[PDB]
Amino acid sequence: SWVWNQMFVLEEFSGPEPILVGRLHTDLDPGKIKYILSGDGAGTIFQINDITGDIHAIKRLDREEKAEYTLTAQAVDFETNKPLEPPSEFIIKVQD
Amino acid sequence: SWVWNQMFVLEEFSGPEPILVGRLHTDLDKIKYILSGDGAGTIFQINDITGDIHAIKRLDREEKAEYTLTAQAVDFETNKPLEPPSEFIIKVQD
């Protein structure tokens, strides 16, 4: 019952310069995973790379405006777009 | 399955002033959070009440890129485990 699916971003260090928040990652193996990000500020505030799974904040964050972002993680096969993981919620929580 | 038990810390923002890394949390309803392993206490410091992990030294990814730690949750009175002891990883920047 450990809860691991949250990430924290320090608002002070956020801005137009992208800052690494976390990474989507599956323990699933070879045989390539495409990482898809949706929900609360996906694309605009938080940007994913579909290959690496890296999530960067690409905007200044303001905890007083919004303190928590609920996002959905997805993983699909590059060729067929068939799911390789269940769509799964995780939370990005903003700093101070 | 999704792997969530990793926390990333940016080396550039580390130093003598503590920066928040992440937080140990159990979905139980009281809980004492205990941290052990790679740099527990010296580099990474936990608040046993809130579960907050701070980095309290300048990190250096060239020296050590990755820290394997153990999360524990115990009862304040009896110190018996409320969760099984679980590994997690703090990864440092670039």
From Swiss-Prot, chain B:
It is found in: Cell membrane. Three calcium ions are usually bound at the interface of each cadherin domain and rigidify the connections, imparting a strong curvature to the full-length ectodomain. This is Cadherin-8. Cadherins are calcium-dependent cell adhesion proteins. They preferentially interact with themselves in a homophilic manner in connecting cells; cadherins may thus contribute to the sorting of heterogeneous cell types. It comes from Mus musculus (Mouse). The gene is Cdh8. The lineage of its organism: Eukaryota, Metazoa, Chordata, Craniata, Vertebrata. It comes from the Eukaryota. Residues 1-94 form the Cadherin domain.
